[model samples]
Target: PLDPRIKELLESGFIVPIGKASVDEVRKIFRQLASAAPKVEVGKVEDIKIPGSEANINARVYLPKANGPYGVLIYLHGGGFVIGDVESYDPLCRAITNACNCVVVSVDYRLAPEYKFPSAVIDSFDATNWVYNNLDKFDGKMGVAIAGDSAGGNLAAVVALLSKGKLNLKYQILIYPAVGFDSVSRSMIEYSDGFFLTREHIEWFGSQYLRSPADLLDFRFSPILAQDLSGLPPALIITAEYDPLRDQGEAYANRLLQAGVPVTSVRFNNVIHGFLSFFPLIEQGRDAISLIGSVLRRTFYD
Candidate 1:
């Protein structure tokens, strides 16, 4: 059963269309209809730039209220690698910064259909290295973590794998990540329709993201296919029980655990995909927000 709140949202037509809509139209609908949770503050938020693979990447930095050094979290927004930008994730970043007392850099990485596969991957990894190298600009502690939802979650997971020895990562938080796209998993079959994230939606997004079918086999785009997951940071993987991506997310968690990475995976029953962004409406989403904050606090302070 869908959570009552989610049911209400569906009844109210609060959903992003997953078809061949224009990118501008989809982005407008998301910005207009999606609930933007009340903004919380750490200390200050600012927009900045960092060098990237193709061009300068725009980023929003959320600095906590604490004095002196602080940890950093490179946050990537999810819109199936197409729709979302830094602005769409502002409120969430504020909440993360306030709750975790860390500098949250919400990355405005380039979207797909224009940049295609491996573009986001390159930009994200570049942004992570930039943050680590330029930590002194924000009085940052040596510790750093990466986190994201949906497509962004895939980036965080891949970044962790790519930057294992180069960057000392403290943790990674993946919310309902689409880690595997090659196989037709059981959850994908069971929750293919009417679950907020349909198989059609996933296919459309993948089409927009990949240049060719061969890209699906690329480990950078699908971390689940990556041979080795050892030496990566500890991780927290969150999945909505009704999301089509749930099984893949859990499978990635299990794979990480098998590869000797400390892992914690949780499923919020009765919720749908994209619940984290709907925290203001879903109780489970709210609870997950609190849990993420608490986990970050402990990881950064403990």
Candidate 2:
């Protein structure tokens, strides 16, 4: 059950009433919220070229002000495959760059309902390839990390899995990632309506990401359904106690463990699904990022 304070928040109308809004509408709300967010610059914003896409994939590369190649983290922003862009995540990216003492590269990928499934995946995979192929240019080490929240986190996981042995991806940081489409988990059932993320919103995102129901069964599309998960990089799967996707996030962590992959599952008892983007507002956001940074440093540096 949701905490009384969170339930009161719902009653108090702090969270948007997602029951009636379309995914695009919800995305617009997120954009508005981000617009109001305080602007903070990461090390530096730069563009990177990615092959096999119609458009030039732009990236915000934030090198720590400190002098060092530092560990590299390729970050993908979450918009449920539909709406986030570089600007939406500028503050968070910069925060990670400064907080983690690493080079943070935020990818601007194609959105869903515009470019459906595999499009975002292709963009992310290509961007990771570009980062690895051109790491020396950024003065980064071979130890690369892929990190993101929600839908972007899903892509990060897939990128790590796809590039397992081919590239030296050191770690994967998933912040309240939505790895499953089904709502069998208790959190989803209880917070499915009143919470910021409802079942409807997830279903809508799923529809935009996949053309048919059959695609839901595809392991790359729905990672929880993947047959094999061994030999991947270490993972930090973060979940929120009241978030609708909580169950699956923890499930993925367990799944990784069962597959013999090094995994650490951390739960934020009072946080919501999208709190990772609001580092300044939620204390847990800072703690979560720092925790992830600690893991990244450990895995790649030490």
Candidate 3:
């Protein structure tokens, strides 16, 4: 059951579904969505190469209007780790670019099944390092932050830990991030059936992301099992009610808080997964984006 407010919003026509589209089809759908959505003005968009990976990680750098490069955001788009590409997520990227006043760099990490777990992580870390090293070119200072939805969220959290001995990071923003490499959490049991992101969908994603069962336990690949969240950047974790991954995302935030890292988390009741990417169509979608914007404005702009 959804929260009454979320149900009301859906009843008012905020709920949009793609209805079991293929991976490529989902990409096409999002591309069309980006085409139709309002453009948030970014100072400029540039393509940059991320070194050290065989995967041709394509990244789009969206500069904000704020004087010089104020801060940096390395955005990883969520598509169950098999579908979303940077081009498909350009709308949200541009919006974030403008809203956060930070240079937003969206990386198209290789999908799974074709590449497996570590591939995505390696590419993302490469992109993160690239952003850190090239901050001056983008007028960016103050290290780099990471943001993503679903599987992308998992990558972002993992990168936060990986960056600890490497780069200086400000914060991490995870939207209903897919955290648990283990699929047996209590929330997983409770919401696996009817939510927009079902257990079946997760199983499908896993089949692609993991080559062997042992891969699931790779700490870099599965951040939920990571020890020592202390000294990590402050985090903002967001989740949607009725989503299978909701509990894991919230749980991660709690873990961060307990580890003494500042964490702020919000779960949008009556909502399903992927609602944050549907801005300009759903009112709540816009509001969620605004919530992110507010957090970044305060966390990064200071």
Candidate 4:
């Protein structure tokens, strides 16, 4: 049940697979995809920097066109740990910001090989801490949440898991998060190629992101390996039906549910990975944004 438009995109060479593409080539493809995406108009967009352990994090803050005491969402953009940046994810951030009525901080965390494993995690968590403390500076006070897609989704999950007594996290939204670095689930086997995210792509990300095989077991790198999922905030886990990461994302949700965390897990049946960024052509992409907004809105207001 592939989405017809997605099929068209696949056939039209607009959505090419990463078949052994060099890091730079892959980066270019991703950037081109972002540039081609339709932008969403929001209240305002501002670029700012947050100090990090390894580098100064460049983050884009999106102000929603809605009135608030607004909640703050620290957004992590996904590019399999290496490729994407704030500019590439601007549209998704703007859409989410508009839909959720929250100050969306799209983090430009240092990517792999240059920064690698614990780097993105530390930078992301540091940014979240800074955002929570500086919400007043952004004209926000409703609450705080963490969200991201793919690798970014995994980062958000780790941040939420690690938040506990620190930030008063309202909830978590993970859009097709990469839950494990080494898992070869059924979906991974079935959708191993030609689904936008290929096995080679996953391996390439790990090659860049992880220091070695040892890093694969580190809970921060792969939230699914975290021993205890308890005491984390409630979560919204979104998965794509054809995604190789789908089983792992759902597994994370199941673990969270078992550990007594409130969970909402939804899978879009006809799309591929990264469809949230393809919302302009894929209806579910927009739908997922609204679902996130509504859930966060309820979490904050109700």
* Model 4 C-alpha lDDT per residue in residues 1-302, reported as the tens digit of each score: 78888889887776534546777887888888876767778887889989776679899989888877788889999998888889889888888888888889999988887877888998999999888888888877787899999899989998987787887898899999998864558999999888888888888788888888888888898788888888899999999999899899999999999999999999989899999887887888999999998887887767
lDDT of 3 by residue, 12-92 (tens): 644223336666676676567555677777787888777755766788989887776477889999977787788878888
Overall lDDT per candidate, in order of appearance: 0.87, 0.80, 0.79, 0.86
Candidate 2 local lDDT, 39-153, one digit each (tens): 6555566766666455678887888777775788999999778877888788788777777778888998888787888888888988998888888878887457899998899
Q: Indicate the residue-level lDDT of 215 in model 3.
A: 78
Candidate 4 segments whose C-alpha is farther than 4 A from its true place? 16-19
Compared with the true structure, what per-residue lDDT tens digits does model 1 show for residues 1-302?
88787888888877788675778888887776554677764687789999886879999999888875788889999999998888878877787777788889999988988998888989999999999888888777747899999999999999998997788899999988989774577889998988778888899899899998888888898899998899899999999899889999999999999999999999989999998787788767768888888898898877
**lDDT of model 4, residue 11:** 77
Regions of candidate 1 where Cα sits further than 4 Å from its true position: none
Q: Which candidate would rank higher by lDDT, 1 or 2?
A: 1
| Poorest stretch of ten by lDDT in candidate 2 | 10-19
TM-score of each: 0.97, 0.92, 0.90, 0.96
Clashing pairs in 2: 81-112
Worst 10 residues of 4 by lDDT: 13-22
